[PDB]
Amino acid sequence: GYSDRVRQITLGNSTITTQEAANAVVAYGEWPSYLDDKEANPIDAPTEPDVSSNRFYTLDSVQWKSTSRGWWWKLPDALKDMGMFGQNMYYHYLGRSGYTVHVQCNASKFHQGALGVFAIPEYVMACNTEAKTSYVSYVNANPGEKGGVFDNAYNPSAEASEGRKFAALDYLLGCGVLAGNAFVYPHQIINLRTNNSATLVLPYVNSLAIDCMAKHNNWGLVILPLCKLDYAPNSSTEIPITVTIAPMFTEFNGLRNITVPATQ
Amino acid sequence: GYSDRVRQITLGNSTITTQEAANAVVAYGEWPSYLDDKEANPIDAPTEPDVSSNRFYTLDSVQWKSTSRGWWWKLPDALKDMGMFGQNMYYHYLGRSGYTVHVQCNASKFHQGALGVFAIPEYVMACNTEAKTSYVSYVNANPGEKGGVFDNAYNPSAEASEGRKFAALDYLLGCGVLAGNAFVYPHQIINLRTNNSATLVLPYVNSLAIDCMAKHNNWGLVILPLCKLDYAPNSSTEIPITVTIAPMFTEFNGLRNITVPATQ
Amino acid sequence: GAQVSSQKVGAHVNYTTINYYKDSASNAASKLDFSQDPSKFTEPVKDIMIKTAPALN
Amino acid sequence: GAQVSSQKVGAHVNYTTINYYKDSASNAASKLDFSQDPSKFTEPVKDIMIKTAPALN
Amino acid sequence: GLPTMLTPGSSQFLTSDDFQSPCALPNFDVTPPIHIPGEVFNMMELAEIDSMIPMNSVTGKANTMEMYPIPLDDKGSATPIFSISLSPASDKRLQYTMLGEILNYYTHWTGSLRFTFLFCGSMMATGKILLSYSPPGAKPPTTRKDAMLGTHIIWDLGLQSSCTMLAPWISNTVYRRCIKDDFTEGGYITCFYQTRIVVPSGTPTSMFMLAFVSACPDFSVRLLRDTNHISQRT
Amino acid sequence: PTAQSTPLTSGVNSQEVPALTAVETGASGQAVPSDVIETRHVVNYKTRSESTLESFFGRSACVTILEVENFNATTDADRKKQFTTWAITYTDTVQLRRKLEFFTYSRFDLEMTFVITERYYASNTGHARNQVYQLMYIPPGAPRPTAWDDYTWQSSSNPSVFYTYGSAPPRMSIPYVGIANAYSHFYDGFARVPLKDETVDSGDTYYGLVTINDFGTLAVRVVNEYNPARITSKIRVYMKPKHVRCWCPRPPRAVPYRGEGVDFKQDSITPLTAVENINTF
Ligand SMILES: [Ca+2]
Ligand SMILES: [Ca+2]
Ligand SMILES: [Ca+2]
Ligand SMILES: [Ca+2]
Ligand SMILES: [Cl-]
Ligand SMILES: [Cl-]
Ligand SMILES: [Cl-]
Ligand SMILES: [Cl-]
Ligand SMILES: [Cl-]
Ligand SMILES: [Cl-]
Ligand SMILES: [Cl-]
Ligand SMILES: [Cl-]
Ligand SMILES: [Cl-]
């Protein structure tokens, strides 16, 4: 009866079902957990918001077209405006979180295409000016739930001031490595003939027990079309990709007034 | 190996197979049985015809169209002309029976639609004149294997004599209750994407141990299109619905000359 | 032949019944019967369905 | 199921109660409850105050 | 006083009530009982006694002693000898039998009915007679070939004078109503020559039988009611 | 016995998927909150006491209003006002009927209660002495009165209640009197089989419970002879099912009744009020 294709995930007041899964990945074989006393750093009693924040948040959907080059998000950036998770994140200097990432993309038995879904620790990307190095604005690095897109062309700006964004070049994974090697990162593939969803469970990953969520993204989420969307009756068809992410084992330290980041 | 979708039913010399079932319903959780001595009423040794009568009888098929409003039968009326079951029914004053009801409707992975299949104890329906109440002819109440159809309009007759038939109004289940509540009755759904058959096993249901089958129908069988048949290449396509019913644990009392009901 | 039974609790407790009549039809209301089996209506299926398992395997 | 209890004394002494109804709401007045704890209103202080000691030391 | 509270029904006179009441003649010394023959305990004891059906209550015979004897002869007609519905309370011929009279004090009846026939021809008369009970819902039998498909007995006339045909309890409902009622109809009792009555010369060629009805030990009645068989002017 | 407590549960990441099912099976959804959210422990002390059948039906409901009068009657029409007969049923009113018709079959004893009220017809015809009422239950077959003072009211065998105006509402219990093993609220059939080529008329025959039901007749009179003052009376009849069992639940009546059957009325078959939009909170 039980199947690698059929899964239920419940966190807080939220449940996901899938009937065409392909198992689930636990990044580096490690389930998320709370911070042990023997690895702790800040000494204030932490906030552990539990079900208020540790629940599935669904981002705005994106459209997969035959011409799409791919999509990226950063975490916890993508969830910074999500209910009580966002409030706990911005009221505290420090936060840590694992995640359940659920990527959703259904089609038909007559569609074809394959998405690589990669969870990348410290997903540092190239800037878009050759007048400077490491020259990216906070606003362009932290787009929130809209994330960003890859391009198949690199056109760095004439003026340094116009190039303060990522050069998200697909085949170099936006960071000077070949995209074919992205499989060293925790991943699944959504191959439309096989599966309609990817599930990645991510532990907290950092060189520290806990860090400034508003300064630092622990994970990149990359969705690359490895094989282009094709549908014989309409080559210009679009199918949605929906990203749903639950924080897990969230813990916050250093309560004060709320952080309100710059928007320009 | 064994599956909720794959079933064989053998009664007497008759077998049904299905490879796209959805379990089977046993109405009110009770398998049919013979009448116990401690619940018996008529004292003559009963006839128990067993395999001669307790076997699958296939009715004339009906056509499901995008415009169909639904179908009804009564039991034992639908089987009154079926082989030795019909003969045993009409040679005796009294009879009782359970049933296996098997409703058959296959399509393709590209068709869509959903049939509600309901077994209704004492399925009393409205008459089609407002000059009288409870004004239905025996002939119109007892159509036999052809059954009847629902309508989405109520047009009661000018003259009482012209309205002696059921006002089988679909959304009021032909009896002044909302069709959405028909799920309180033993039921399955044939949802073309999921299943191609419904199986209901019905015990004898009555306020008596045994009754006059020629006077009284114990069960109604209702098939309602909950979601209309749709097929993109031809919206005017028709797919058959086939009803196959086996009497079970049949028992008859009060043998005499044969009952020949009025036909006009 | 007095029956002593628990009362239904109020804001904050036995009561006594004697039947005065030779016919049970004369008696007051039947005692609270908490019997129920919703599954005969909500799950009247031949083959057991385990909630955590697929409904259709 | 008769309850026998002390009466409230008069000028100069048990009484009998049988409950006739299946609902406690039907019952006569609750029995005298002499419970009291005035200190929850008259002395709701965190630290014990001994009458003979200074209130503020 | 003991606190009390009057309920609905207070002060009503229900004619089927069963209460105590003060005696108008206290300390009265009743006449001692003695044994009297023929004590009755139950009206169903009386229902089990055979009484004669006025089977031939036709014009000119109704309300005469000639309403009882059922005409027989040696002609061997295929026509039924008598035909009657199993409506023991309401039928024009069964309602005035002892069983019929008892049933008309009740609303509901159940059980088997016994029909006993006494042949009153000469000793020299022979014959075979078919007696049939057809449970309802089919064409009422008017020919022997339909009657013999039902519950029946072939009675050979001889030294044993009498034959019992049973209408066994065969009903949808657990009780039938003591009125004419389609829902609780009981079916059809008929009678045909199986052979014919044969007599030698110097013997009557026409004769009679008597039909009796009684309840079986499986028989009971309920729901006491007033009869429609007694009335008075006001 | 209480309604279900909620267990303490956290999240899952599992091949166990209680959120998905297939209602094609004829099974209702079964999942509970602990299957699809993180739950705290909540002890549930609450009971379903008031939704037992005995609790649901444990009320005296008005089932009819009868009329009787007491005056010097000189015409046939006025003589017929001195008593009334009523075929006993629950179908003259809608409220108890609709509750019973959640079920196909029932078995219960009956408490019957009566409320009797009077008024003076006129002011210029003097006064009236306190009236006694006779309510006589006439089982099927027992003779029905044709006058308020005929022989039938001697009631040797029929149960009668004599009620004195101003006294407590009269009341009696009736056993389960059905000739079947339960009462039928619905009967999909006829009282007789019409047969091939019979001369019996098939054009004016009825269908369903009305062809087979007969709970007898209630006959009511004022026992008193006439006063100069005409008195008009109403008798309200109340029924409470007690010691109740029911079988085979049904959707409840969604549209007005128009008689003793399941028939509906063309101007009254639109119970839903249309919403402005599928997205209306
Ligand atoms: Ca002090
Ligand atoms: Ca509980
Ligand atoms: Ca499931
Ligand atoms: Ca849970
Ligand atoms: Cl969206
Ligand atoms: Cl955002
Ligand atoms: Cl700003
Ligand atoms: Cl066909
Ligand atoms: Cl047919
Ligand atoms: Cl005909
Ligand atoms: Cl009198
Ligand atoms: Cl008087
Ligand atoms: Cl609205």
From TrEMBL, chain F:
This is Genome polyprotein. Capsid protein VP0: Component of immature procapsids, which is cleaved into capsid proteins VP4 and VP2 after maturation. Allows the capsid to remain inactive before the maturation step. Capsid protein VP1: Interacts with capsid protein VP0, and capsid protein VP3 to form heterotrimeric protomers. Five protomers subsequently associate to form pentamers which serve as building blocks for the capsid. Interacts with capsid protein VP2, capsid protein VP3 and capsid protein VP4 following cleavage of capsid protein VP0. Interacts with RNA-directed RNA polymerase. Belongs to the picornaviruses polyprotein family. Ca(2+) 3 binds at T2, A3. Ca(2+) 1 binds at L20. Signal peptide: none annotated. The chain holds residues 605 to 885 of 2214 of the full protein. Residues 2-13 have a biased composition (Polar residues). It comes from Coxsackievirus A24. It is found in: Host cytoplasmic vesicle membrane; Host nucleus; Virion. Coiled coil: none annotated.
